[PDB]
């Protein structure tokens, strides 16, 4: 598994691969690991599949619940805190092997400068969190290859689309050097999933765009 | 048999007492395989083998009861796709070793054969001509009772190759 | 790893993939696992890479050594025995993790019927061996998928070429369902290796033929 | 044990073998492992026999209980969820050896296209579930052989009957390559059990039909 | 595995099944477990396949070696002793799991009464042996079922052929109640192997006779 | 520690950092890890400092010893073999913690094409070796960052000098992302060490050249 | 224990404290830990007292033995090597607790510049050694405090006497911050021991000089 | 050949029976390498070998 997230001027993008394994055995060719938890935050989760999907679901429920009770969404700080508390709560089970790590991307509507209202937040197994400020983050078995790819490719990011292409490429290199991360399957037509958040909220990138970017990368490397 | 493969490009002929020359044959085969396994095939050379026999023979003669009534010839050719002159060494019973440029004659009365070869020898003679020269100088015979083999430099790896039967008859 | 071997009327064919891993990490994209140990036998070895290459080398040396001393190759039975004794010798180290299993394909020149002189022989970690008689065998992490593929595809085998295509396909399915087995890399142009043995000895299949067969399979599945 | 399930145009079919063992000892020659939990879902359970029969019974009770209280069956999604929660509840005992895995087949009456309203759902020991979309699934010790059989035989599936024959054949190959799975006993006349679900509900296939299909397969292989 | 041996008036018969397993997996459908070690003794070996075939081979070599040196075969007592010493020698490895138990059938030419010169001898893992005197013996995972079958069927034994039929039936019941023992495969045509020893030496029963007896039993039970 | 090696048209270059640690404590600021074992091979060794320096010394002795006895250096293949045998010999101590891994760079004088006579060879703890063919290699705690840097920077390599600059940069990124690898110390004036091998043998790069390249990189990143 | 050594222009100085403990108990108030192993080398040893005194004695014997056999002392390099081999030999016992670490000071008569012919060499438990080049070294429980003292005081070193005073002060701070190191005992009149090596050989500093320096330091701190 | 390198700065020539003088050649080569490895290259001298 591998989930990358990067800020671009005016927004944030978050992409994730599709494979799920048991040991050396490829068990799922089309899992979706990036959820839209709310109109301004998307959440990726690496790790145990059960714990992951459960985290995502329950967190979305809690954000929206407070929103319905108080008539206003939490600030990005409150959201960060609740996610952190959930993660800290799973620590006992994470030592027993059921570890799940979330990467949280959001667009702060209350930030001062709109061009840098993008937000990326990373968590460890012990619930501590860190607001990333070098422009990108990743999680999962391929995270190191993905980060080392984005470090070089990141000067190319200038808008929503270039940022999306850089995301897809970083995923391609993760998969290229790690076997637990699936690359674009040209045969079955299964590509990474992506979410874009900007001033207007969070939308899923439609599959065709990711397909074209992936084919461009693959032809570039041949 | 009195002619034998020793290694990829190294051949061996002998004359004397069969059990002893045969025994050296075996010892020589033994040394090359182990050496090749430790380092490599192209590292075993006709020179190293020629040397081993001489030292062994000298020591053996000095410490044993009866000297080996044998005369050895170790031959080497170049590898595939390379140019180099064939090397012939003669090792005598005492340990002496001699480097021969053209031909070696072993066992029996060597003078008449050596002289006939001295008149008939021609460098770069084909296989048939060299066979005629060698049989002629050897007579100084019949199709039967002849042991003929070559170290064919053109083979890819194992150069030694016997020439027996009908093909030999056709050649002669 | 996965190495298949199948008899066809008049000969035997033996093919192997190219990947070598350490855990989830792809470490070698072009290893050769099938050797021509002699003019009538090829040997594939699955398992620890060191122990594998060493087995192959030493066995070839021993076959040829006896051949030089006695002036005649061993019978296929003697060859089977020596390989078995080597395998039995590695048992202590195989329990310590350095396991290497050989699959031996040969063409018996002394057999009565030339059309069925092909021979396939399989070994376990304890040196016992078995002469396969259902027409095919495989070894390695993908062996079960490869065998279950050949069971269905084997009625198509009628000559050297059809047998070769069936071999390549079996490998393709092994790789398709197991991540430790590499499939045909169309990008880098690396394909399985194959050896064909018949009445005239053992020859390596030149890469182009394997490339065409692999491309035919891949287009068939799209 | 082995339980296969496959969709066909217009419905779903689910079949299971009859053997139950203790170690190497054959203890039950006529166990029924596929239940009709309700008018549109059948459930197979592999694993510990006690835990299996209990799961099936209790789940059927719960589906029908909510149906009586609310006056309408749950959606297929709710059913999936409750089954998943039961499975997650048995996890502690599954680590102690009492593992039971369910495979759930259903016919969604609310789906848009009737020809693809069939549904197959698979579970792991940790309660996570997955909606199968490659057309078939299996569970139990013979599941790998059954799946590798259906992958090849599945293009033949065109209706209810051909789908049934493919199911029976997949079971035959599972049993053929695994000793814990029983094949058709021609001597005692005991054949796999099968359930068919389509627009009109769930019905048990009467034994005679399964007997004829099994005899056809057995004569085909001779 | 299961190997039965029974005396009949004037001789001895010894039969063995054909299956060889690894866990629940059927790995060999045609292994031969009963050897003719010499002109008057046959030896069956249950247990680890390697150790078994090795025992048989080496024992045959030793019997014949002493015969060539001294110009006369050992007495049946000496043969019993040497086999016992081999078995005692494998004890260390048998505790490590490589256990092999032999059952030795012979025809004593030096016995006083020819009608009771048949001999059956059984061994334990510790090399102790016992001369069976209730007329029959068996070894292997199915041995208890085989013995309990022969206890009832043994009054029917009156000659070489009836004794052979009783042997085959005992094997059939062993296989019927134990999964590690293979029964007659009517599909592939693989039947138990049998050796008959009488005043004229040891001969292998040709397959056709065993086929007919097996078909008679199978039709009797339907 | 980190040692990179890369081929360039006409030669090979091999560079290594200077730090040596004990836990978190920086213990050596000027260790030399790349030796010139002979006129055409340089050897880097990562791992335990004692075992490393000893390996290098003893291997150089052995190469030169055979050269003096036989009057001709070993082929590159023989050298590879001897190094491999040494490495295999240290395996027992490597399991006890004294692990040392060598990376061997050489220039084959006997190769056919001079422009590609460069050679890079990598070893594991078990003595197996691999001839690198993607143009570069690295070893040590920073090896992954170094390789991921060279993968991108390698199209810039066109001669001896550009290849040297790429080497130094790869080291800079290794040190930038790993704390056990020392970068260029501008304060004390300690820079990585480098060896260049081409048709004319092996020479140490004089320190000034490495100083200028390092200062160019450092100013480029500011 | 604590033994410092520092180069000064034209020579080297080496000083050591006098305490020896067992746990919290002060057992020796006047141990001598710095020996003159030969006319140009002094050796300090920290660690187990037995192993220490033995090392020193045996090493002195070996240096002088080779000198008597060959008629010329070893070079400083050879001496370094022999000491290293001894240290490597004690490794098994050092893991069992009998660890002894030597610090070797020498004056190279063969060096080019006399003003920098001083030499300091440090060893670890595994026999590896390092030629110190930042001007000073120390060993023992107080070594860190001693080094951190000399780093600041070392610019004051300009000759033999100032270098001696700096040595004594470094010892004073070691003892001041660690309880296993004894300071100058003014009551009993026991002071550190010191050896000075320069162009004319090695001489022990007479006690009076060390007494005056220690009293100067002690009055400076009051 | 009757002239040979023995060590860095030590050479060797001989006259007599080739196998024997050759054998000494080998023995001399042997001693120097081991000695150097134990102590050092500059410690082997022509005198010790002689």
Swiss-Prot record, chains A, C, D, E, F, G:
- Reaction it catalyzes: Cleavage of peptide bonds with very broad specificity
Which UniProt keywords are present, listed alphabetically? Autocatalytic cleavage, Cytoplasm, Hydrolase, Protease, Proteasome, Threonine protease, Zymogen
Q: Name one GO cellular component term.
A: cytoplasm
Q: Which residues form the active site?
A: 1 (nucleophile)
How is this chain's activity regulated? The formation of the proteasomal ATPase ARC-20S proteasome complex, likely via the docking of the C-termini of ARC into the intersubunit pockets in the alpha-rings, may trigger opening of the gate for substrate entry. Interconversion between the open-gate and close-gate conformations leads to a dynamic regulation of the 20S proteasome proteolysis activity.
One GO term of the biological process aspect: modification-dependent protein catabolic process
Localization: Cytoplasm
User: Keyword Chloroplast on this protein?
Assistant: no
Query: From which residue to which does any coiled coil extend?
Result: none
Q: What is its EC number?
A: 3.4.25.1
Q: Does the keyword Lipid metabolism apply?
A: no
Q: In which pathway does it act?
A: Protein degradation; proteasomal Pup-dependent pathway
Q: Which GO terms describe its molecular function?
A: threonine-type endopeptidase activity
List where the protein spans the membrane. none
The annotated subunit structure for this chain is: The 20S proteasome core is composed of 14 alpha and 14 beta subunits that assemble into four stacked heptameric rings, resulting in a barrel-shaped structure. The two inner rings, each composed of seven catalytic beta subunits, are sandwiched by two outer rings, each composed of seven alpha subunits. The catalytic chamber with the active sites is on the inside of the barrel. Has a gated structure, the ends of the cylinder being occluded by the N-termini of the alpha-subunits. Is capped by the proteasome-associated ATPase, ARC.
The entry sums up its family as follows: Belongs to the peptidase T1B family.
UniProt function note: Component of the proteasome core, a large protease complex with broad specificity involved in protein degradation.
Q: What is this protein called?
A: Proteasome subunit beta
Q: Which organism is it from?
A: Mycobacterium tuberculosis (strain ATCC 25177 / H37Ra)
Of the intact sequence, the residues represented are 58 to 279 of 291
Swiss-Prot record, chain H:
Q: Where in the cell is it found?
A: Cytoplasm
Domain of life of the organism in this record? Bacteria
Quaternary state and interactors: The 20S proteasome core is composed of 14 alpha and 14 beta subunits that assemble into four stacked heptameric rings, resulting in a barrel-shaped structure. The two inner rings, each composed of seven catalytic beta subunits, are sandwiched by two outer rings, each composed of seven alpha subunits. The catalytic chamber with the active sites is on the inside of the barrel. Has a gated structure, the ends of the cylinder being occluded by the N-termini of the alpha-subunits. Is capped by the proteasome-associated ATPase, ARC.
The record's similarity note reads: Belongs to the peptidase T1A family.
Functional summary from the UniProt entry: Component of the proteasome core, a large protease complex with broad specificity involved in protein degradation.
Q: What is this protein called?
A: Proteasome subunit alpha
**Which organism does this sequence originate in?**
Mycobacterium tuberculosis (strain ATCC 25177 / H37Ra)
